[PDB]
Design a protein around this ligand. Structure first.
Ligand code: CLA
Ligand code: CLA
Ligand code: CLA
Ligand code: CLA
Ligand code: CLA
Ligand code: CLA
Ligand code: CLA
Ligand code: CLA
Ligand code: BCR
Ligand code: PQN
Ligand code: SF4
Ligand code: SF4
Ligand code: SF4
Lengths: 86, 119, 79, 670, 51, 184, 125
C-alpha cells in the first residue's frame, strides 16, 4: 500500500476526490480555509498510485502527496485482475 | 604430456557449470517459498519481528527508536517549556503545554507499517 | 593453432606449449584441500552474515562478554 | 458566402483549438499548436466544418502532388540529359538533377554524358517518359504545363470547397455514390482511357524506337500518322510475360495496353455487378464503419498493401523499357515502395485505434484476449524459431562444426511451397539478358531464402501484434478500466499499479513504428543482397554468369556473421570510401549524417522530460539573473512529444543510413 | 590466476623467449567443440589453449 | 643527445629565447609554399579535377565550369602559400595563440564573431526588456524588433555601462534560487 | 465464455478423458501414462538431427538425452509439488501434495519406460 498524505495547504477543491479512480479520498469538515473543508485519505489501501489526485490539485505545491512504496505493494495497490491474493 | 589435466576438467567443468548451477536454482526456488525468504528486504517476515524485539530487549537499545530519546531529565525540560509558554501565552488562551504536546504527538496515520500484522 | 590477426602472421608470433604436465595431480589435490577449507569457511561466513548479530544472546549464552583493554581505551579516547 | 474568408485569423495562431485560446503562456503551447493543426475532429465548430476541412485539405494535398509532378517534368525538360539517354539508355545514367558550383559542391555532379554532369537520379522517371512516348523537349514542356494547370485547379478547388460545402452538405456521406462512381469512372473508364493513350501514342512510338529509328524521321513518323503499323504489331504470339521485348528488356507495350483495356472492362463490369452481388454479411461492417478515421485506416492499409505489391512487381515483372538493366532504378523502385507500405500500414493501425476511441468498435474486441494472446504465442514461436536458426548456424560455425548448421550443404530446410510455386512466371528454362546485364533470372530458393522468409513473417507478426494490441485495448483493459476517458494519446495513467507508462494506442503506434522499421530493414537487406548475389550482374559469352556479389547469399546469409561481413561491411566499402569521388560524395556524407541522427534520437528515446525540465529551470535561473525573461515560459518537451521526436529521428537516421549504403554501392557498381 | 598460470599455461617457456612468444591464460575444455579434426586453438592433437 | 630518439620521435626546441614564442618558429610547422606535402596534395587535387574535366566534351559548359574550378584550386594553392602547415601533413594550420599578425590566425574571426554575437544577444535582451509580455513574443512588434536590432551595435559599451551601474545583473534574492534542500 | 474448442461436447469429453483428468485413475496410473507418452516422444528429437545423429549408434545417445529430459522435467515437477503442493490428487487424510508427488515419480518411471521402448523399437526395427 502507498502513503497518501493531505497537508494544511488544502483549500477544499474536491478535485482530488473526484479524480481518484478507487475512492481513496474524501472530504471532511475543517476550519483552516474559506471552504471549511479539507481532503482526507481514509482508504489508501485502495490507492493504486495513479497520482491523478496530484494532477488535479491546484495549490502551489500539492496539498495532497502520494508516496510510492514498491516494496509494499498489495493486490489492491497493484490492480491485480487475473490473480487473487486473498 | 601437456594434457592429463583434462582429467580434472572433465569432472569439474560439468560439475560446477551444470550440477551446481541446477542445484543452486532448485534450492533458490525452494527457498523462495519459505516464510523466512528474503526476510531482510521483504516486509512482514517473522524473523524481522523477532530481530527487532531482540534488539529492543537489549538494555542499551530499549529506547533507541524514539526520536525524542536523549532528554536526561525530561521533567526539567517540560517544566522549563511550560514556564516559557506561560509568559508568552496569548491573552486568555486555554491551551496548556502538556495537552498541546500530547495532541501534537498523536497523529492519524492508520496505514503506516500495517504490514506488521501477518508474520 | 590457426592464427588470426595481421600481426601474428606477419611477425611469426608463436605460442609455446610445455611438453610436460605443469602441476602433478598431488599438487592439484593439495590446492583443492585448502580450496575446500576456504569453501567451508565461506559458507559459514555467509550463514553468519545472513542471520546477522543476535543481541538477545546475553539472556541465554554463557559467559559474561568481554571488552579488550585496548577497546575500552579506544572508547574513551574519543571518536 | 466568401465574405467570411478573412485573414483576421492568420495573426491569431491557435484559433482552431479552444484549448489554445488561453494564449502562449509556455513553450508547450507551440508544440500543441503544431500537433492539433490537422486534427480537424477536435477543432472548434460543427461537424460540417470537419467535412469541409477534410475535403479541401485532400484537394490541397492533391495540388501539392501535382506541383511535385510538374517540378519533375520541368527538371526533365530543362535540367536533364534525357536526350542522350533516349539515344543510348544503356550507356547513360539518368540525371535530371544538378548541383550549383558553391562550397565545392561541384564535386557532386558526375559524368553521366559527354555533355552533361549531374546527380544520377534513381526515380525511374526517364523510363516512365520513354514508356510514355515522350521524345521531344516540347512534350515535357506541355506535361509540366498541364501539371501546373492541375496544381492551380486543385488549389482553387480546395479554396472554393471551404465555402461551397455548407452545413447541409452530404455528398461525402453518400458511400454508394462514391464507390460506384470511383470504381466505374476511374478504375474502369480511366483504365480504358490509358489503354487508348498507349494504343494511339506508345505503339505508334515505342516500336519505332525499338525498330532502331531513334530518328523516327523526326516528326514525320513519330508525330503519329502511323496507322500502317497495326496495334498488335510485335506481340509474337507467346504469353504476356513469358517472352520479353529483346530490345528494351520489358513486356511489350501492346500487351500492357491490352492489360489496361481488359482491366478497365473488368472494373466497369464489377461496377455493374455491384447492383446485385454478395452482401448482408459485411453489412455490420457497412453500418459501423461510416466514419472518417475508420475509412482512413482502411484506405491506408489498402494503399500500403498495394504499395508492397508494386514493390515486388516492379522488379522482376519488367514493364518499363530499359529499366531492368538500370539496377539502381530497380532497387529504388522496390525499396521506396516497401518503406511506404510499412509506414502506411502503421498509419492504418493508428487510425484504427483512433476510430475505436472515437466511434464504437465491433464484435471482435470482446474476445480480444484470445486474439492478442495467440498472436503473442505465434510471435514468440516464430521468433524463437526463425532467428535462432541463424543463432544455431552462427554458434556451430564458430565451433567449427559446419555439418551441423542449417545450410544447403548441411541440414537443409527446403522451401517446399516456393519450390513448388513455379506457377508464377512459369518462364522457359533459361535466363534473359540485354547488354552485358541480366534482365531477370529465376531466384533459386534454398535454405537461406526459407530462413529469411520466416524472419520476415516473424517481424510482420510482431508489428501486427503491437498494432492489434493497441487497437483492441484502446477503450479499456484489465490494467486500466477507463482508458476511453484518457483520450487517444496520453503519456500514461501514472506510476501506480506498478507503472502505467505507454498504455495509450499512440504509444502502441510508437513501438509499432520501431518494429515496422526493423521488419522491412530486413526486407531491404534480403532484397539488396539476394538480387546482387543471384540475379543482377555481368555475363560471359560462354553462358556463364558473374553476379555482383559472386553468389555470397547462399553461403553467407545462413549466419548473422555472414550478414555483418558480406553485406554491412564488404558491400559498404563503396559508401565508406566515397570521399572525393565525384558521384558518391553526398552518399558518404549522408551515411555519416544518418548515423549521427540515429544516435541523436537515443537522447529523446532513453531520457524522461523531468531531467530536461530541471536543467531548463537551472538555465532559466541564469537568464533571469541578467534580466532576460522569456514570457513564453521554457518547458521541456511533453512525454508524448519526446517519444515522437525520438521515433522520428531514429527512423529518419536509419533510413538515411540504408539509403546511402544501397544507393552509393549500386551507383558505383553500375 | 596464479594456479592457472602454474598448471594450464607455459610460463616456464614464455620466460625464456618473451618477445615473440605468447602466454597462455588457461586450457579450453568445452564439449561443444569438434570431437574430430583440430580446433584453431590447439596444435593438432595437443590440448586447447587461450592466449 | 638527439632529443628526437630520446622522446620517441617528437623534437624539443631546447632554446629559451622570446623570439621562439611565435608559432612561426615551431619546428613542427613550415610555410606551405615550401612544403612537399602541400605541393603533392594540391597537385593531386589539380590532377583529379583535370582528369574529370577531360572526360567531358571540349566545347561543353561542363568543360568551362571545370576550367573555373581549376582556376579556383590554383588560386587556393597560391593564397595558402603564406599559411603555416605541418612538416608532415601539408594541411595549413590555424593559429590560436593570440598572435594577431599571422596568416590563418583565430584572433580576427574571434573578434568579429564576439562582436556580432554580443550584438544578437543584446538586441534580444533589449527587445525582451522593452516587451514585458508573452503576447509580444508570439506576435513580434516588428518596428520595435528592428529598432532593437539596429540599436544593438553599441552593445560593447552599453552592456558594460549597465554592468557597472547595476542594471544588468539582479540580486539572487529576487529570482527563484531553485528547489528547497531543507526545512524540517 | 463458452467456445467450441473448450466447451463443446467433444472438447469437454477429450479434456476430461486425459490422463491428468480421467476419472477412476490412481495417481501412479496418470503419471505412468503421461510419462510413457513423454519418454516415447522425447527420443526422436535427439536420435535424429542430434550431435551424434550419423554415428553407428545414434540412438543410445538419443535414449540418454530423452531420459535426461524426462528426469529434468520430473525434478521440476517435484519442485512444484514441494512448493505449490497441489492437493487435487491427494486422497482424504494424507500428507498434502502426496498424490502429485506420486504422479510425478511415476511420470519419471513412465518416461524411462517409454524412452526405452522407443529405443528398443528403433534398434530392433
Ligand atoms: C516541388 C518539387 C520541386 C523540388 C523538390 C525542386 C527542387 C529544386 N529545384 Mg525546382 N522547380 C519546381 C519544383 C521543384 N523543384 C517547379 C514546379 C518548377 C517550375 C516552376 C521548378 C523550376 C526550377 C528551375 C528553373 C530551377 C530549379 C532548381 C531546383 C534545385 C535548386 C533550387 C534552388 O536554387 O532553390 C531556390 C530556393 C528558393 C527560391 C527559396 C524559396 C532543387 C533541386 C534549380 C536547379 O536545379 O539549378 C541547377 C533551377 O535552376 N527548379
Ligand atoms: C476530387 C475532386 C472533386 C470532387 C469530388 C468535387 C465535387 C463537387 N464539386 Mg468541385 N471542384 C474541384 C474538385 C472536385 N469537386 C476542383 C479541383 C475545382 C476547381 C476548378 C472545383 C470547383 C467547383 C465549383 C466551382 C463548384 C464545384 C461543385 C461541386 C459539387 C458538384 C459538382 C459535380 O457535379 O461534380 C460536388 C460536391 C459545385 C457545387 O458546390 O455545387 C453546388 C460548384 O459550384 N466544384
Ligand atoms: C475510351 C477511350 C478511347 C478514346 C477516346 C479513343 C479515341 C479514338 N479511337 Mg480508339 N480504341 C480504344 C479506346 C479509345 N479510343 C480501345 C480501348 C480500343 C481497342 C483496341 C480502340 C481501338 C481503336 C481502333 C481500332 C481505331 C480507333 C480509332 C479512334 C479515333 C477515332 C474513333 C472514335 O473516336 O470513335 C468514334 C466512335 C465509334 C466508332 C463508336 C460508334 C459505335 C456506334 C455508335 C454504335 C452502333 C453500332 C451499330 C449498332 C452497328 C479516336 C482518336 C480509329 C482511328 O485510328 O482514328 C484515328 C481506329 O481505327 N480506336
Ligand atoms: C486479357 C488481357 C490481359 C493482358 C494482355 C494482361 C497482361 C499483363 N498483366 Mg493483367 N489482368 C487482366 C488482363 C490482362 N493482363 C485482367 C482481366 C485482370 C483482372 C484480374 C488483370 C490483373 C492483373 C494484375 C493484378 C497484374 C497483371 C499483370 C500483368 C502483366 C504481367 C503479365 C504476366 O507475367 O503474366 C504471366 C502469365 C502483363 C502486362 C501484373 C503486372 O502489372 O505486373 C507488373 C499484375 O500484377 N494483371
Ligand atoms: C493519408 C494519410 C494520413 C492522414 C490524412 C492523417 C491524418 C491525421 N493523423 Mg495520421 N498518420 C499517418 C497518415 C495520415 N494521418 C501515418 C502513415 C502514420 C504513421 C506514422 C500516422 C500516425 C499518426 C499519429 C501517431 C497521430 C496521427 C494524428 C493524425 C490527425 C492529426 C494530425 C496532425 O495534426 O498532425 C500535424 C502534422 C504534423 C505534426 C507533421 C509534422 C511532420 C512529421 C511529424 C515529421 C516528418 C519528418 C519528415 C518526413 C522528414 C523531414 C526531412 C528531413 C531531411 C528534415 C489527423 C486526423 C494524430 C491524432 O491525434 O489523430 C487524431 C496522432 O496522434 N497520425
Ligand atoms: C551453445 C553455446 C555454448 C555453450 C553452452 C558453451 C559452454 C562452455 N564454453 Mg564455450 N564457446 C562457444 C559456444 C558455447 N560454449 C563458441 C561458439 C565459442 C567460440 C568458438 C566458444 C569458445 C569458448 C572458449 C574459448 C572457452 C569456452 C568455455 C566454455 C565453458 C565455460 C563454462 C563456465 O565456466 O561457465 C561460466 C559462466 C559464466 C561466468 C557466465 C555467467 C553469466 C562451457 C562448458 C571455456 C572453457 O573451456 O572452460 C573450461 C573457455 O575457455 N568456450
Ligand atoms: C542430468 C540428467 C538426468 C537427471 C537430472 C535425471 C533425474 C532423475 N533420474 Mg535419471 N537418468 C539419466 C539422466 C538424468 N536423470 C540418464 C542419462 C539415464 C540413463 C542411464 C538415467 C536413468 C535413470 C534410471 C534408471 C532411474 C533414474 C531416476 C531418476 C530420478 C531420481 C530423477 C528424476 C530414477 C527414477 O525415475 O526413479 C523415480 C531411476 O530409477 N534415471
Ligand atoms: C520393452 C522393454 C525393453 C526392451 C525389449 C529392450 C530391448 C533392448 N534394449 Mg533396452 N531399455 C529399456 C527397455 C527395453 N529395452 C528401458 C526401460 C531402458 C531404460 C533404462 C533401456 C535402456 C537401454 C540401454 C541403455 C541400452 C538398451 C539396449 C537394448 C538392446 C539390447 C535391446 C534391443 C542396448 C542397445 O542395444 O543399445 C543400442 C543399450 O545400450 N536399452
Ligand atoms: C501429427 C498429428 C497429430 C498429433 C499426433 C500426436 C500428438 C501423436 C503423439 C503420439 C505419441 C506421443 C505416442 C506415444 C506413444 C507412447 C508409447 C506407445 C509408449 C509406450 C511405453 C511403454 C510400453 C513402456 C513400458 C515400460 C514401462 C511403463 C516402464 C518399465 C519399462 C517398460 C518399457 C516395460 C494431430 C492429431 C494433432 C493432427 C495431425 C497428425
Ligand atoms: C533533449 C531533450 C529535451 C530538451 C529538448 C528540447 C526542449 C528541444 C527544443 C530545442 C529547440 C527549440 C529545437 C529547435 C531546433 C534546434 C535549435 C536546431 C535544429 C536544427 C539545427 C541542425 C540547425 C526534452 O524536452 C525531452 C522531453 C522528453 C523526453 C526527452 C527529451 C530530450 O531528450
Ligand atoms: S485537489 Fe488539492 S487543494 Fe483541492 S481539495 Fe484536493 S487536496 Fe485540497
Ligand atoms: S494516487 Fe490515484 S488512487 Fe491513489 S489517492 Fe491519488 S488519485 Fe486516488
Ligand atoms: S515514468 Fe513517465 S510515462 Fe511512466 S508512469 Fe511516470 S510519468 Fe508516466
Amino acid at each position: 500500500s502507498h502513503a497518501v498524505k493531505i497537508y494544511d495547504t488544502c483549500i477544499g477543491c474536491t478535485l482530488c476526490v473526484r479524480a481518484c479512480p478507487t475512492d481513496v479520498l474524501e472530504m471532511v469538515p475543517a476550519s483552516i480555509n474559506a471552504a471549511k473543508q479539507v481532503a482526507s485519505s481514509p482508504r489508501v489501501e485502495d490507492c493504486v498510485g495513479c497520482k491523478r489526485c496530484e494532477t488535479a490539485c491546484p495549490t502551489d505545491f500539492l496539498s495532497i502527496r502520494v508516496y510510492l512504496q514498491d516494496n509494499e505493494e498489495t493486490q489492491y495497490s497493484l490492480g491485480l485482475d487475473l490473480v487473487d491474493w486473498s | 604430456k601437456y594434457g592429463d589435466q583434462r582429467k580434472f576438467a572433465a569432472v569439474l567443468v560439468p560439475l560446477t557449470t551444470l550440477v551446481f548451477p541446477a542445484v543452486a536454482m532448485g534450492m533458490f526456488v525452494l527457498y523462495s517459498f519459505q516464510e523466512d525468504a528474503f526476510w531482510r528486504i521483504v516486509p512482514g517476515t517473522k524473523r524481522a519481528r523477532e530481530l527487532d524485539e531482540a534488539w529492543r530487549e537489549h538494555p542499551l537499545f530499549a529506547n533507541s527508536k524514539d526520536p525524542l530519546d536523549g532528554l536526561i531529565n525530561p521533567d526539567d525540560y517540560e517544566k522549563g517549556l511550560e514556564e516559557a509558554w506561560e509568559r508568552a501565552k496569548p491573552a486568555g488562551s486555554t491551551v496548556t503545554v502538556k495537552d498541546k504536546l500530547k495532541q501534537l504527538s498523536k497523529q492519524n496515520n492508520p496505514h503506516w507499517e500495517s504490514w506488521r500484522a501477518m508474520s | 593453432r590457426v592464427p588470426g590477426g595481421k600481426r601474428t602472421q606477419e611477425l611469426g608470433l608463436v605460442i609455446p606449449m610445455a611438453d610436460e604436465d605443469g602441476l602433478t595431480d598431488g599438487q592439484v589435490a593439495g590446492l583443492f584441500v585448502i580450496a575446500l577449507v576456504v569453501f567451508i569457511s565461506a559458507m559459514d561466513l555467509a550463514k553468519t552474515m545472513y542471520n546477522g548479530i543476535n543481541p538477545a544472546k546475553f539472556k541465554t549464552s554463557k559467559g559474561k562478554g568481554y571488552i579488550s583493554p585496548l577497546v575500552k581505551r579506544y572508547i574513551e579516547n574519543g571518536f | 458566402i466568401f465574405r467570411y474568408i478573412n485573414t483576421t485569423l492568420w495573426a491569431k495562431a491557435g484559433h482552431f483549438n479552444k484549448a489554445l485560446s488561453k494564449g502562449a503562456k509556455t513553450t508547450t503551447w507551440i508544440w500543441n499548436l503544431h500537433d492539433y493543426a490537422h486534427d480537424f475532429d477536435i477543432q472548434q465548430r460543427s461537424t460540417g466544418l470537419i467535412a469541409r476541412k477534410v475535403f479541401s485539405s485532400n484537394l490541397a494535398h492533391l495540388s501539392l502532388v501535382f506541383f511535385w509532378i510538374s517540378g519533375m517534368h520541368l527538371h526533365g525538360a530543362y535540367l536533364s540529359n534525357y536526350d542522350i539517354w533516349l539515344k543510348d539508355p544503356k550507356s547513360i545514367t539518368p540525371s535530371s538533377h544538378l548541383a550549383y558550383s558553391l562550397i565545392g559542391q561541384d564535386i557532386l555532379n558526375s559524368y553521366t554524358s559527354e555533355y552533361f554532369s549531374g546527380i544520377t537520379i534513381t526515380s525511374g522517371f526517364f523510363q516512365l517518359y520513354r514508356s510514355e512516348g515522350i521524345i521531344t523537349q516540347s512534350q515535357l514542356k506541355y506535361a509540366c504545363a498541364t501539371s501546373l494547370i492541375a496544381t492551380l485547379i486543385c488549389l482553387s478547388g480546395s479554396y472554393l470547397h471551404m465555402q461551397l460545402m455548407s452545413k447541409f452538405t452530404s455528398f461525402y456521406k453518400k458511400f454508394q455514390s462514391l464507390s460506384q462512381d470511383h470504381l466505374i469512372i476511374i478504375f474502369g473508364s480511366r483504365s480504358t482511357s490509358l489503354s487508348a493513350h498507349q494504343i494511339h501514342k506508345m505503339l505508334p512510338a515505342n516500336p519505332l524506337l525499338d525498330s532502331g529509328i531513334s530518328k523516327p524521321s523526326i516528326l514525320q513518323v513519330i508525330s503519329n500518322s502511323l496507322s500502317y503499323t497495326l496495334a498488335l504489331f510485335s506481340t509474337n504470339l507467346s504469353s504476356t510475360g513469358k517472352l520479353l521485348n529483346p530490345s528494351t528488356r520489358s513486356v511489350f507495350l501492346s500487351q500492357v495496353a491490352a492489360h489496361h483495356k481488359t482491366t478497365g472492362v473488368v472494373f466497369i463490369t464489377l461496377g455493374l455487378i455491384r447492383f446485385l452481388t454478395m452482401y448482408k454479411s459485411q453489412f455490420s461492417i457497412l453500418t459501423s464503419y461510416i466514419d472518417y478515421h475508420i475509412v482512413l485506416s482502411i484506405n491506408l492499409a489498402l494503399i500500403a498493401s498495394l504499395s508492397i505489391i508494386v514493390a515486388d512487381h516492379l522488379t522482376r515483372t519488367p514493364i518499363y523499357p530499359h529499366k531492368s538493366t538500370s539496377y539502381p532504378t530497380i532497387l529504388c523502385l522496390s525499396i521506396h515502395h516497401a518503406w511506404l507500405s510499412g509506414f502506411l500500414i502503421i498509419g492504418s493501425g493508428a487510425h484504427a485505434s483512433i476510430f475505436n476511441l472515437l466511434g464504437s468498435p465491433t464484435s471482435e474486441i470482446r474476445h480480444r484476449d484470445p486474439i492478442y494472446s495467440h498472436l503473442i504465442w505465434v510471435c514468440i514461436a516464430i521468433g524463437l524459431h526463425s532467428f535462432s536458426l541463424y543463432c544455431h548456424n552462427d554458434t556451430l560455425e564458430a565451433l567449427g562444426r559446419p555439418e551441423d548448421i542449417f545450410h544447403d550443404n548441411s541440414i537443409q530446410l527446403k522451401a517446399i511451397f516456393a519450390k513448388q510455386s513455379f506457377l508464377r512466371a512459369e518462364l522457359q528454362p533459361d535466363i534473359e539478358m540485354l547488354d552485358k546485364k541480366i534482365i531477370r533470372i529465376t531466384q533459386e530458393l534454398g535454405t537461406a531464402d526459407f530462413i529469411v522468409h520466416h524472419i520476415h513473417a516473424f517481424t510482420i507478426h510482431v508489428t501486427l501484434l503491437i498494432l492489434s494490441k493497441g487497437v483492441l485495448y484502446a477503450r479499456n483493459s484489465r490494467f486500466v478500466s477507463d482508458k476511453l476517458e484518457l483520450g487517444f494519446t496520453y503519456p500514461c495513467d501514472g506510476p501506480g499499479r506498478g507503472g502505467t507508462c505507454q498504455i495509450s494506442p499512440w504509444d502502441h503506434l510508437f513501438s509499432a513504428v520501431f518494429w515496422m522499421y526493423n521488419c522491412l530493414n530486413v526486407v531491404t537487406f534480403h532484397y539488396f543482397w539476394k538480387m546482387q548475389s543471384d540475379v543482377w550482374g555481368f555475363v560471359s559469352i560462354q553462358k556463364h554468369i558473374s553476379h555482383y556479389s559472386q553468389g555470397d547469399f547462399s553461403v553467407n546469409s545462413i549466419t548473422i556473421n555472414g550478414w555483418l561481413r558480406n553485406l554491412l561491411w564488404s558491400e559498404a566499402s563503396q559508401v565508406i570510401q566515397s570521399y572525393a569521388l565525384s558521384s558518391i560524395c553526398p552518399y558518404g556524407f549522408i551515411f555519416l549524417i544518418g548515423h549521427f541522427i540515429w544516435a541523436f534520437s537515443l537522447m529523446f528515446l532513453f531520457s524522461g522530460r523531468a531531467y530536461w525540465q530541471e536543467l531548463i529551470e537551472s538555465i532559466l535561473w541564469s537568464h533571469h539573473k541578467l534580466k532576460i525573461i522569456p514570457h513564453i515560459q521554457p518547458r521541456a518537451l511533453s512525454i508524448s512529444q519526446g517519444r515522437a521526436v525520438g521515433f522520428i529521428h531514429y527512423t529518419l537516421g536509419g533510413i538515411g543510413s540504408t539509403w546511402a549504403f544501397i544507393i552509393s554501392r549500386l551507383l558505383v557498381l553500375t | 590466476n596464479l594456479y592457472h598460470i602454474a598448471s594450464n599455461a607455459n610460463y616456464s617457456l614464455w620466460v625464456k623467449n618473451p618477445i615473440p612468444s605468447m602466454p597462455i591464460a588457461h586450457n579450453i575444455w568445452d564439449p561443444h567443440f569438434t570431437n574430430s579434426t583440430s580446433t584453431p586453438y590447439s596444435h593438432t592433437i595437443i590440448t586447447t589453449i587461450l592466449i | 643527445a638527439k632529443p628526437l630518439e630520446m622522446f620517441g620521435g617528437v623534437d624539443i626546441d631546447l632554446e629559451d629565447t622570446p623570439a621562439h614564442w611565435t608559432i612561426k618558429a615551431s619546428p613542427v610547422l613550415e610555410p606551405c609554399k615550401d612544403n612537399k606535402k602541400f605541393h603533392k596534395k594540391l597537385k593531386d587535387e589539380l590532377y583529379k579535377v583535370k582528369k574529370n574535366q577531360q572526360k567531358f566534351a571540349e566545347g561543353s559548359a561542363a568543360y568551362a565550369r571545370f576550367n573555373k574550378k581549376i582556376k579556383m584550386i590554383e588560386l587556393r594553392e597560391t593564397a595558402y602559400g603564406d599559411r603555416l602547415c605541418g612538416k608532415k601533413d601539408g594541411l595549413p594550420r590555424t593559429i590560436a595563440t593570440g598572435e594577431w599578425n599571422v596568416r590563418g590566425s583565430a584572433m580576427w574571426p574571434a573578434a568579429i564573431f564576439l562582436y556580432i554575437a554580443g550584438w544578437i544577444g543584446w538586441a534580444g535582451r533589449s527587445y525582451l526588456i522593452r516587451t514585458n509580455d508573452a503576447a509580444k513574443e508570439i506576435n513580434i512588434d516588428v518596428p520595435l524588433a528592428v529598432t532593437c536590432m539596429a540599436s544593438g551595435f553599441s552593445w560593447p559599451v552599453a552592456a558594460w555601462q549597465e554592468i557597472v551601474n547595476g542594471e544588468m545583473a539582479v540580486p539572487n534574492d529576487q529570482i527563484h534560487n531553485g528547489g528547497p534542500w531543507n526545512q524540517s | 465464455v463458452i467456445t467450441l474448442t473448450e466447451n463443446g461436447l467433444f472438447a469437454k469429453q477429450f479434456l476430461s478423458a486425459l490422463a491428468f483428468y480421467r476419472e477412476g485413475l490412481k495417481p501412479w496410473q496418470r503419471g505412468l501414462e503421461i510419462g510413457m507418452a513423454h519418454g516415447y516422444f522425447l527420443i526422436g528429437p535427439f536420435t535424429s538431427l542430434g550431435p551424434l545423429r550419423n554415428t553407428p549408434e545414434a540412438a543410445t545417445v538419443g535414449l540418454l538425452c530423452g531420459c535426461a529430459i524426462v528426469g529434468i522435467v520430473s525434478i521440476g515437477g517435484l519442485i512444484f509439488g514441494s512448493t505449490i503442493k497441489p492437493t487435487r490428487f491427494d486422497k482424504d487424510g494424507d500428507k498434502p501434495g502426496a498424490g502429485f508427488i506420486e504422479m510425478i515419480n511415476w511420470h519419471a518411471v513412465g518416461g524411462l519406460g517409454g524412452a526405452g521402448f522407443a529405443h528398443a523399437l528403433i534398434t530392433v526395427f
